[PDB]
Design a binder for these strands. Structure first.
Ligand SMILES: Nc1ncnc2c1ncn2[C@H]1C[C@H](O)[C@@H](COP(=O)(O)OP(=O)(O)OP(=O)(O)O)O1
Ligand SMILES: [Cl-]
Ligand SMILES: [Cl-]
Ligand SMILES: [Mg+2]
Ligand SMILES: [Zn+2]
Length: 1126
DNA sequence: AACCGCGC
DNA sequence: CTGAACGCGGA
């Protein structure tokens, strides 16, 4: 029935595909031996696999219904392309609670599912919840196969009610009786929701990005070919008209240009109803690497521009089309204008919106670079615009044009608009080719998804897909998706939430620290004595564990060891010192993954007294659980329920004629939501607050012999990441090694650094998601304990490192697995052991001294591993892959202080390299999206000025002067400033993550700005999420809270009568005549925001370093004034 | 004082 | 259709 309609869609997709160069190839019959080694004899066709999609195909011993399979899209060795199809029966499993009667379940379902089922068979998989699975005992399952996905789904609909009824109702008849019936032996269904395209990719072991010979026997991987083929790649950007101060609307606005690149050649299509002259061919090439020669197609009108776009696409047959935010802007705009002119985009080029509203084709991936930017670039959201991505990643400054000017320029400056247009397409193309393409296509060679999907899935889902492969290949039955309990209780209280204590963070010092200014150190001599004692084993560890060598082959072991001993002896004698610091950072390499692999942590290894039989074997580890719960007691929970049972509720389901519901008729979940809300208020009143928070120390057993498929998946991804982390580092060394002796065109090395950095960090987030995965909603491998255990072990490790550094130096800031500190310049630093072959091994003593201790204290001596699987013989050993590494030493580090007494600021600092360049800027407003622009421009001026002066006081003086420049701008009420520049500086921009409707009963500057934009510029302004609310704070109304005084800066570009009516409303001043921004602004508000910044970054830290207020126009808070009396 | 949205 | 900790300024 629906079968026959899906067959019609397939057949339409087949026509699109043949038009774009993908005819279905069916390889020749070959009765011989499907053999993989003589691949070159066997009949068939070799191809680079570039895409795949589920489909439904006809026969050409079933009926008049379609067969599920997957179309795979290939590029051939000869410059052509084709597709070929694999068919496979979808399947899922039934599990039983009584093995002895598996035959009765089988007989029952053969019949119960007669209308949908293709076949059935008894199979066995490893079940990691089952006793004696480690001695080879397997779980027996019924595998149910189907002709297609529709039939699979009917099986699920027939079976779900049985499983419901089984868990839901007690059927008593003869109370004096209870040969049980078949239904109740079905305990569950398993692997029932694995998406079909994935199921095929996993079971057949096929991946996009690899080369296959297609044969009658199936796809044969060509392991000899690894280099990718070269798809035809197109990138495009559109430019549209729009009204002043509003957003483009595709119902009325028109497309004026489409710029694009195809394999490095530019095209610009122009709409001459709008663009007021024929644009000529021109070059925009921002680096020799990025050529852009553009050819022009001046079309008479909009429809022609569209027809020219589609026809060109049909001409070149791109198999990647890339955009920047094309799923949300470009594509839908193109689709809606196409429809207005009676064109069918799907018929013209095979693109349509999918169920997510995203634009997809069969034959061509839509690689929206913005998705890679948000997921994988590691850029702050403040730098995720094309402009900022272009500077960061391609290393040049693209053309910029104010959005308000694009429509007018069509008429007035059509050449300038076209230069902007083509700049977009250039940035987009090369961003795609250099960053997105290699990453996504390479990820596809290991993740069982197509490029579109691989670009867009969450990193947690990516992890899931990796783990599923590993589980499937080791024959491990997948757990079903976890579902959170609707309500949990602790000590009779309902929990609002529960979690575990995470990373450990500390602010220890504020101030300016610089390699040419001296600091006071107080060395604990008993620390030096421990170091001296450990020294022989610590250097041996460096040689043999950190460098994988043997002291045996070391020439100068004793020399190095004397040299260190002397520096330490000196520190021990003369332990009160005043000298120049070494500014170091030490940080554990991939911290949580290594804690996990060291301790053999994975969800299936967490045993709760059952049932390793028995769980030497058990490794007990601590975590810290933290609950937040209502004060109310059970008895008062029960009270609130019956008060809700007297109430009426609206039917949320819109499909139904019934719109009043009793409490009992709502689902468990919704019942609880209402309970929670009523319990919030009852608690305040009686108690008197919402949450009570409590931390409880806990313990869990981690079995050291459990099947290690999960942790092995993490180790393997970790090694994949280290390769790129290593390359990043190797290139950094070369650019300083000898390759930095100007002049050179390396340049290439710097390009390398940026690339491998991006690649090791794109790997970092997926790697770390293997940790987060165990807490994800719907995780197949859920374990709060595993996650808790990981974090507490890391907190203990990093406090141990802090306790040492603090005895020999001064730690400044600490976060999770990293410590910024200063050490005396006399502290022993870097050496190189000489090998017999003459080679040298690097030693950073600050790092090795910590790592030696980490290995004494945090090694897992209980790690087991199958040494002989046929016999199940285990071997035990000692594991530890946790290592600090060192970066630095640096020229300076500047840490801010809080406005509150005795409190620091975590997660904000600035660090500078020896060469004077900025090495790190963390957390500050400058980096964050949105934020008051004046504060960003301030911070952007001040940090580098900490490198000036010869004394600490001179350094604070140089920065005072910049503070006084900025204070003059505000004391002068902006007068010394252009009016455009003023609006720009005073503006605060904040994203609303949802739409204005969903914020009801909340207040904030964004909400008020959005509402007023709505009233003034129309409801279209606020129908979408992600609105940028740009506003200023007004002096009036006096006595109103700040959120009532956000004015959208857009109002200052409205016609004068409009502006007037609104500023009057918004300030509650009927008779206002003065409309100058300068009289509207609340200067005291801005002076207080700037004052704050000056306190945290400059004056209060100055005070803590015993420097007297270098910026007197900003007064210390009282506590600090008071502090300074004697 | 305790909460909320956004952004290692 | 990954996690927790934190800074800021808004009863
Ligand atoms: N995105 C994340 N998701 C979950 N956990 C994270 C994430 N980012 C950081 N963490 C946790 C796990 C990390 O191991 C730990 C330390 O972070 P960090 O030192 O930045 O990275 P790392 O130790 O994993 O890599 P690196 O090798 O570069 O130091 O904090
Ligand atoms: Cl971030
Ligand atoms: Cl975020
Ligand atoms: Mg780290
Ligand atoms: Zn065990």
């Amino acid at each position: 029935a629906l079968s026959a309609q899906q067959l019609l869609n397939a057949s339409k997709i087949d026509d699109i595909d043949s038009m774009m160069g993908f005819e279905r190839y069916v390889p020749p019959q070959y009765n011989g031996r499907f053999d993989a080694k003589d691949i070159d004899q066997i009949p068939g066709r070799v191809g680079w696999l570039t895409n795949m999609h589920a489909t439904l195909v006809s026969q050409e011993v079933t009926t008049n219904q379609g067969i599920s399979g997957v179309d795979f899209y290939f590029l051939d060795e000869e410059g052509g392309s084709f597709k070929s199809t694999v068919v496979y029966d979808p399947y899922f499993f039934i599990a039983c609670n009584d093995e002895s009667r598996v035959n009765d379940v089988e007989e029952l379902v053969k019949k119960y599912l007669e209308s949908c089922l293709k076949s059935l068979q008894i199979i066995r998989k490893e079940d990691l919840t089952m006793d004696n699975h480690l001695l080879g005992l397997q779980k027996t399952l019924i595998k149910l196969s189907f002709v297609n996905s529709n039939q699979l789904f009917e099986a699920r609909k027939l079976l779900r009610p049985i499983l419901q009824d089984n868990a839901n109702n007690n059927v008593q008849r003869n109370i004096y009786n209870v040969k049980v019936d078949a239904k109740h032996l079905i305990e569950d269904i398993r692997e029932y929701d694995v998406p079909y395209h994935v199921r095929v990719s996993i079971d057949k072991d096929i991946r996009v990005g690899k080369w296959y010979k297609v044969t009658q026997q199936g796809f044969i991987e060509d392991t000899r070919k690894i280099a990718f083929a070269d798809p035809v790649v197109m990138a495009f950007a559109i430019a549209t008209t729009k009204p002043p101060l509003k957003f483009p609307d595709s119902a009325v606005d028109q497309i004026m240009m489409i710029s694009y690149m195809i394999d490095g050649e530019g095209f610009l299509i122009t709409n001459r109803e709008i663009i007021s002259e024929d644009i000529e061919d021109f070059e925009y090439t921002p680096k020799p690497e990025y050529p852009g020669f553009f050819t022009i197609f001046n079309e008479n009108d909009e429809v022609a521009l569209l027809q020219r776009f589609f026809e060109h696409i049909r001409d070149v047959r791109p198999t990647v089309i890339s955009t920047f935010n094309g799923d949300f802007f470009d594509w839908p705009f193109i689709h809606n204008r196409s429809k207005i002119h009676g064109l069918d985009m799907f018929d013209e080029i095979g693109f349509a919106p999918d169920a997510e509203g995203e634009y997809k084709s069969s034959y061509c991936s839509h690689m929206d670079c913005f998705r890679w930017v948000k997921r994988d670039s590691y850029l702050p959201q403040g730098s995720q615009g094309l402009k900022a991505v272009t500077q960061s990643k391609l290393g040049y400054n693209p053309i910029e044009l104010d959005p308000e000017l694009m429509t007018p320029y069509a008429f007035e400056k059509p050449q300038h608009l076209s230069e902007y247009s083509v700049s977009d397409a250039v940035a987009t193309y090369y961003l795609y080719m250099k960053y997105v393409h290699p990453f996504i296509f390479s990820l596809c060679t290991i993740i069982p998804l197509n490029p579109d999907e691989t670009l867009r899935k969450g990193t947690g889902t990516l992890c899931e897909m990796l783990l599923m492969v590993q589980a499937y290949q080791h024959n491990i039955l997948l757990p079903n998706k976890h579902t959170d309990p609707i309500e949990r209780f602790y000590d009779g209280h309902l929990l609002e939430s529960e979690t575990y204590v995470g990373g450990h963070v500390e602010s220890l010092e504020a101030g300016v620290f610089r390699s040419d200014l001296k600091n006071e150190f107080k060395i604990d001599p008993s620390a030096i004595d421990e170091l001296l004692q450990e020294l022989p084993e610590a250097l041996k560890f460096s040689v043999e564990v950190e460098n994988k060598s043997s002291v045996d082959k070391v020439t100068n072991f004793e020399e190095i060891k004397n040299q260190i001993t002397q520096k330490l002896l000196e520190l021990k004698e003369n332990n009160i010192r005043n000298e120049l610091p070494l500014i170091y950072h030490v940080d554990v390499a991939s911290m949580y993954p290594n804690i996990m692999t060291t301790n053999r942590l994975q969800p299936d290894s967490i045993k709760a007294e059952r049932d390793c039989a028995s769980c030497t074997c058990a490794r007990k580890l601590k975590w810290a659980w933290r609950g937040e719960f209502f004060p109310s007691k059970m008895d008062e929970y029960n009270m609130i329920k019956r008060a809700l049972q007297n109430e009426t509720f609206p039917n949320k389901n819109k499909f139904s004629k019934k719109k009043v519901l009793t409490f009992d008729e709502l689902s468990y979940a919704d019942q609880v939501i209402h309970i929670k809300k009523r319990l919030t208020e009852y608690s305040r009143k009686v108690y008197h607050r919402v949450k009570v928070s409590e931390i409880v120390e806990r313990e869990a057993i981690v079995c050291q012999r459990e099947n290690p498929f999960y942790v092995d998946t993490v180790k393997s991804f970790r090694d994949r990441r280290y390769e790129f982390k290593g390359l990043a580092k190797t290139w950094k060394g070369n650019l300083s090694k000898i390759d930095p002796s100007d002049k050179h065109a390396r340049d290439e090395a710097k390009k390398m650094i940026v690339l491998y950095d991006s690649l090791q960090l794109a790997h970092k987030v997926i790697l770390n998601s293997f940790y987060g995965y165990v807490m994800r909603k719907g995780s197949r491998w859920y374990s709060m304990e595993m996650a808790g255990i990981t974090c507490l072990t890391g907190a203990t490790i990093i406090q141990m490192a802090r306790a040492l550094v603090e005895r020999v130096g001064r730690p400044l800031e600490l976060d999770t697995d990293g410590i910024w500190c200063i050490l005396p310049k006399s502290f022993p630093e870097t050496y190189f052991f000489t090998l017999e072959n003459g080679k040298k091994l690097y030693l950073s003593y600050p790092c090795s001294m910590l790592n030696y201790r980490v290995h004494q204290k945090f090694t897992n001596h209980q790690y087991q591993e199958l040494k002989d699987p046929l016999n199940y013989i285990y071997e035990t050993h000692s594991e530890n892959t946790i290592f600090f590494e060192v970066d630095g030493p640096y020229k300076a580090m500047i840490l801010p202080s809080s406005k509150e007494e005795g409190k620091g600021i975590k997660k904000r600092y600035a660090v500078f390299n020896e060469d004077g360049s900025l090495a790190e800027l963390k957390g500050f407003e400058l980096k964050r999206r949105g934020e008051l622009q004046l504060i960003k421009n301030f911070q952007s001026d001040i940090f580098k000025v900490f490198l000036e002066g010869d004394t600490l006081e001179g350094c604070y003086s140089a920065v005072a002067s910049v503070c006084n420049r900025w204070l003059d701008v505000l004391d002068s009420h902006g007068l010394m400033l252009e009016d455009e520049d003023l609006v720009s500086l005073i503006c605060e921009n904040r994203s609303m993550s949802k739409t204005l409707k969903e914020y009801e009963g909340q207040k904030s500057t964004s909400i008020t700005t959005a509402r007023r934009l709505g009233d003034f510029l129309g409801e279209d302004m606020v129908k979408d999420k992600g609105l940028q609310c740009k506003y200023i704070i007004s002096s009036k109304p006096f006595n109103a809270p700040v959120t009532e005084r956000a004015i959208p800066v857009a109002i200052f570009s409205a016609d004068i009568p409009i502006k007037r009516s609104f500023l009057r409303r918004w300030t509650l001043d009927p008779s206002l005549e003065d409309l100058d921004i300068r009289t509207i602004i609340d200067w005291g508000y801005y002076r207080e925001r700037l004052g704050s910044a000056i306190q945290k970054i400059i004056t209060i830290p100055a005070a803590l370093q015993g420097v007297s207020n270098p910026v007197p126009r900003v007064e210390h808070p009282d506590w600090l004034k008071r502090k300074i009396a004697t």
